[PDB]
Amino acid sequence: AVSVALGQTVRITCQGDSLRSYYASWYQQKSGQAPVLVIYSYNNFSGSNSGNTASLTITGAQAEDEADYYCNSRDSSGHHLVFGGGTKLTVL
Amino acid sequence: AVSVALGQTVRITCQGDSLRSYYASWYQQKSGQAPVLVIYSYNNFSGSNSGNTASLTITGAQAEDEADYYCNSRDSSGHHLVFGGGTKLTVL
Amino acid sequence: AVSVALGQTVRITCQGDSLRSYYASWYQQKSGQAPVLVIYSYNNFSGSNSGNTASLTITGAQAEDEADYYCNSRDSSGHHLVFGGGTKLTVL
Amino acid sequence: AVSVALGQTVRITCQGDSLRSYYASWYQQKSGQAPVLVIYSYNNFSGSNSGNTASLTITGAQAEDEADYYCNSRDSSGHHLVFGGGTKLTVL
Amino acid sequence: AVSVALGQTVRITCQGDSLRSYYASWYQQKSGQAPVLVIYSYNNFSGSNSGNTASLTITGAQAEDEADYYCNSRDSSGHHLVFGGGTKLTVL
Amino acid sequence: AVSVALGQTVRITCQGDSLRSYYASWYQQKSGQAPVLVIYSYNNFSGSNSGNTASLTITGAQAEDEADYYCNSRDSSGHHLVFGGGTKLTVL
């Protein structure tokens, strides 16, 4: 009569070798990530039956080195269903 | 009669080898990511039955090195359904 | 009678080898990403039954090196359905 | 008659070796991530029957080094269903 | 007649060796993560039958080094179902 | 007649060796994580039948080094079901 099934099957398989060999003297300098962000500063939404998905993301500085080598499923998601105002499924 | 099935099958398979060998002296300098962003600064949405998906993203500086070598499914998603104002599915 | 099925099958398979070998002394300099963005600065939406998808993205500086070598499904999505004002599916 | 089944099967299998060998003197300096973010500073949502998913994320500075080498499922999710205004599934 | 089954099977298997050998004198300096965030400072939601998922995250500075080498399922989740306004599943 | 079964089977198996050997004098300095966050400072939700999941997280400074090498299932979760306004499953 009714069958409601919410399933998520995530099968991730990685086979790899990361061999990193430095045989000689080296120098790395990635210094100085100081972005100055000044937003909406130093200056002189929805109604009754609705569905609203709003995202504000502010990041000053992000820096990834030698990372996420294999099968990086970070922050994975699915089927975002933002319904508003009343849902009705009916069979007669 | 009713059957509502929300499924997501993610099967990721990577087979690789990353061999990185430096046999001689080297120098790398990626310094100086200080973008100055000044937005809406230093200066003298929706109604009753609606669905609204708004995204504001501000990033000052992002820097990825030697990253995400294999099968990078980072921030993956699907079927974003932002419905507003009342949904009705009916059979007679 | 009613059957509503939201499915997403993502099957990604990569087989590769990244062999990077430097046998001699080298120098790399990618310094100086300081774009100055000044937006809407230093200066003297929708009504009742609607669906609105608005995106504002501001990035000062982005820099990817030696990244995303194989099968990069980063930020993947599908079926964005922003409905407004009331939906009705009816059979008699 | 009714069968409601919410399932999530996550099978992640990684086989890899990360061998990192430095045979010579080296120097790394990634100093200076002091982004100055000043947001909405120094300056002189939804109604009755609704579903609302709002995210505000502010990060000053994020820095990942030599991390997430294999099978990184960090912050993984699925089937976000934000329903509002009353749901009714009915069979006769 | 009714069968309601909420299941989550997470089977993670990693086999890897991280051998890190430094045979020569080295220097690493990642100092200076003091982002100054000043938000909504120094300046002169939902109604009756609804489901609302709101997240505000503020992080001053995050720094991960030599971490999450294998099978990092940190902060994993699934089937977030935020229902509001009264649910009714009925068979006759 | 009724069968309601909430199950969670988490089987994590990691086999790895982390051998870290430093044969020469070294220096590491990661000092200076003093982000100054000043939020909503120095300045001159939901109604009757609803389900609401709100998270506010403020972290001044987080720093992980040489951590979470294998099978890190820290803060793992599943099937967050925040229902509001009265649920009724009925068979006749």
Author numbering:
A (entry chain C), B (entry chain B), C (entry chain A), D (entry chain D), E (entry chain E), F (entry chain F): 9 to 52, 61 to 108
Q: What does the study report here?
A:
Systemic AL amyloidosis is one of the most frequently diagnosed forms of systemic amyloidosis. The disease arises from the misfolding and aggregation of monoclonal antibody light chains (LCs). All fibrils contain a stable core that is formed by two segments of the LC sequence. These segments extend roughly from residue 10 to residue 50 and from position 60 to position 110 and harbour the fibril cross-β structure.
The first patient (FOR103) showed strong cardiac involvement and fibrils were isolated from a biopsy that was taken from the abdominal fat tissue. The amino acid sequence of the FOR103 fibril protein was obtained previously based on cDNA sequencing and mass spectrometry (MS). Comparison of the mutant patients’ sequences with the non-mutated GL segments led to the identification of six amino acid changes in the fibril proteins of patients FOR005 and FOR103, and fourteen in the fibril protein from patient FOR010. FOR103 amyloid fibrils, by contrast, are right-hand twisted. The dominant fibril morphology from each sample was structurally reconstructed to a spatial resolution of 2.92 Å (FOR103) and 2.25 Å (FOR010), based on the 0.143 Fourier-shell correlation (FSC) criterion. The reconstructed three-dimensional (3D) maps were fitted with molecular models that depict polar and C1-helical fibril structures that consist of single stacks of fibril proteins or protofilaments, similar to FOR005 fibrils. The swirl is defined by the position of the central arc of the amyloid key relative to the N- and C-terminal ends of the polypeptide chain. The swirl of the key is right-handed in the FOR005 and FOR103 fibril proteins when oriented as shown in Fig. 3b, and left-handed in the FOR010 fibril protein. All three fibril proteins enclose a number of buried cavities, but only the FOR103 fibril protein contains a cavity that is lined by polar and ionic amino acid side chains and which is large enough to fit a number of water molecules. The FOR103 fibril contains even an additional cavity that is surrounded by hydrophobic amino acid residues. This cavity is filled with density that does not originate from the polypeptide chain, indicating that it contains a hydrophobic inclusion as an integral part of the fibril structure, similar to the previously described λ1-derived AL amyloid fibril structure from patient FOR00614.
